[PDB]
Structure 1
Amino acid sequence: SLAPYASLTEIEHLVQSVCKSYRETCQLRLEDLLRQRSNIFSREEVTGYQRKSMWEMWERCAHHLTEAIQYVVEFAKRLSGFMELCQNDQIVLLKAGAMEVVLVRMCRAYNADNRTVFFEGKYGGMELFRALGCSELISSIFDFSHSLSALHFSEDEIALYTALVLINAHRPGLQEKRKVEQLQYNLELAFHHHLCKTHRQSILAKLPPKGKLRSLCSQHVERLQIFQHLHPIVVQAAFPPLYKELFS
């Protein structure tokens, strides 16, 4: 909501609204990800992924990331207040934040018991991604999901925290910074109210720093520039156009 001086009733309604927008666009139900924890890639399947060409593995990951971003775009379209921002600001917020929201949501698909992530129907470790040729970035993404796994978020906490990762009034290029600041503040009141009622405000000091998410996004953009030099026709022929627009 963009309402100035939002009352306690409005903040409680905003907590409910944000949680419902997230539930309708969460992509996979948490119970489905948990039910599949015993479905792990066999050693022969891992060898098969590691044998794939770099272009084939980049194309698969770009497709899966694009599908996850499509759900974040729908989350934004349903998020209280987002469609009241100007067209430019909506685009500036999604271009800088859709990838960051996906990286946060991905902690639900990470199993700390065996350090594996749900990918293409089964759970696999970072070794599954070897053919991409960006081991440092993959290892950093697994470490980031591991840091969020340790905070043990509920679905409601993910909904309120991802709304704030997206509604960031400090993004360069915003034209109505003051309007985004009001929406960000109301979402912060909603997140803090939910955390206070459930005795979870102690997680605020444990959230990843202002810089961790930007580093992962900047590394992705850098590795894609290296990939596009080695395979300049694969991107224009097979990658999703939304992916090329956001990261090229």
Structure 2
Amino acid sequence: HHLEVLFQGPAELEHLAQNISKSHLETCQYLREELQQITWQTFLQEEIENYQNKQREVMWQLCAIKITEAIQYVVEFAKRIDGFMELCQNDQIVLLKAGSLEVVFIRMCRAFDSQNNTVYFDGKYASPDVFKSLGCEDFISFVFEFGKSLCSMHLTEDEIALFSAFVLMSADRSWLQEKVKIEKLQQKIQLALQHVLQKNHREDGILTKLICKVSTLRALCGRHTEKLMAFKAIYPDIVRLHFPPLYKELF
């Protein structure tokens, strides 16, 4: 009893860390190790040429399909975050609309080869050149730069899990009803994230460097929306008839 009391604090942090870490583990398609083992499998020059030969709307539709697949996993992750299912549906939707793609871009660092500037896409590791047909060179550059930036931190799976849960449970999203409840949940997550970070590298104070990225994510995801809207303006029927419904619902 007395021992249990002496441990209650750190125990709680560890319990929350382990819970989120498990949820992350169980909602990623591949193990970190599996992705790392195949970074050499880049697209062949002919394959790259084939993607570049695709028409803008074709490449867009493909990217939307693949993003949506990743988002599905993120939705499963969200469902497992304690507190998330207790929120009103309105807030669950607001949080997912804003944060699902943020988590996708965080998860990207696991499937990103920083040394070679490539990302796991459609079966193999893709350089920026693979995405030329989108007509979004600056955005693609931004994505890969973010990949490199986040990779530079050498985040563990648990760190990614907790950081993902942190940006998802953001109390400052527009239009939230239960801001105070969400804020309290995020605070608890931040403490567990800090707990997990200084367990590996008390060499620095990277928590702030991590939270610094929070702003970049928002900008990156903001750009994605802006571009999707411009694309939709030009190809309304492609979006209506050929884009994944979940993607349309979210964005």
- TM-score with structure 2 length normalisation? 0.92
> Does residue 88 of structure 2 align to residue 86 of structure 1?
yes
Q: Residues of 2 paired with 1:210 and 1:198: CA distance?
A: 21
> Does residue 208 of structure 2 align to residue 205 of structure 1?
yes
Please name the residue that 2:48 is paired with.
46
Please name the residue that 2:243 is paired with.
239
Q: How does 1:62-211 map to 2 (within 5 A)?
A: 62-200=64-202, 202-207=205-210, 208-211=212-215
Q: Residues of 2 paired with 1:10 and 1:83: CA distance?
A: 20
Query: Against the structure 1 CA distance between its residues 116 and 210, is the aligned structure 2 distance closer, same or farther, given a 3 Å change threshold?
Result: closer
Of 191-200 and 48-57, deviating more is: 191-200
Q: Residues of 2 paired with 1:121 and 1:37: CA distance?
A: 11
AA aligned opposite 2:64: A
Q: CA RMSD in A?
A: 1.4
Structure 2 residue runs without a partner (length 5+) = 1-7
Please name the residue that 1:3 is paired with.
none
Query: Percent sequence identity over matched residues?
Result: 53
Q: Residues of 1 paired with 2:177 and 2:230: CA distance?
A: 32
AA aligned opposite 2:205: S
Deviation at 1:210, TM superposition (A): 4.2
Query: Against the structure 1 CA distance between its residues 199 and 36, is the aligned structure 2 distance closer, same or farther, given a 3 Å change threshold?
Result: closer
Deviation at 1:197, TM superposition (A): 2.7
Query: Against the structure 1 CA distance between its residues 33 and 210, is the aligned structure 2 distance closer, same or farther, given a 3 Å change threshold?
Result: closer
Deviation at 1:26, TM superposition (A): 1.4
> Does residue 13 of structure 2 align to residue 11 of structure 1?
yes
AA aligned opposite 2:154: H
Q: Residues of 2 paired with 1:102 and 1:197: CA distance?
A: 25
Structure 1 residue runs without a partner (length 5+) = 1-5
Q: Residues of 2 paired with 1:112 and 1:199: CA distance?
A: 21
Deviation at 1:22, TM superposition (A): 0.3
Q: Residues of 1 paired with 2:66 and 2:12: CA distance?
A: 36
Q: Residues of 2 paired with 1:24 and 1:210: CA distance?
A: 24
How many residue pairs get aligned? The number is 242
- TM-score with structure 1 length normalisation? 0.93
Q: Residues of 2 paired with 1:171 and 1:219: CA distance?
A: 17
Counterpart contact for 2:43–2:124, Cα < 8 Å: yes
Please name the residue that 2:32 is paired with.
30
Q: Secondary structure at the match of 1:211?
A: helix
Q: Secondary structure at the match of 1:216?
A: helix
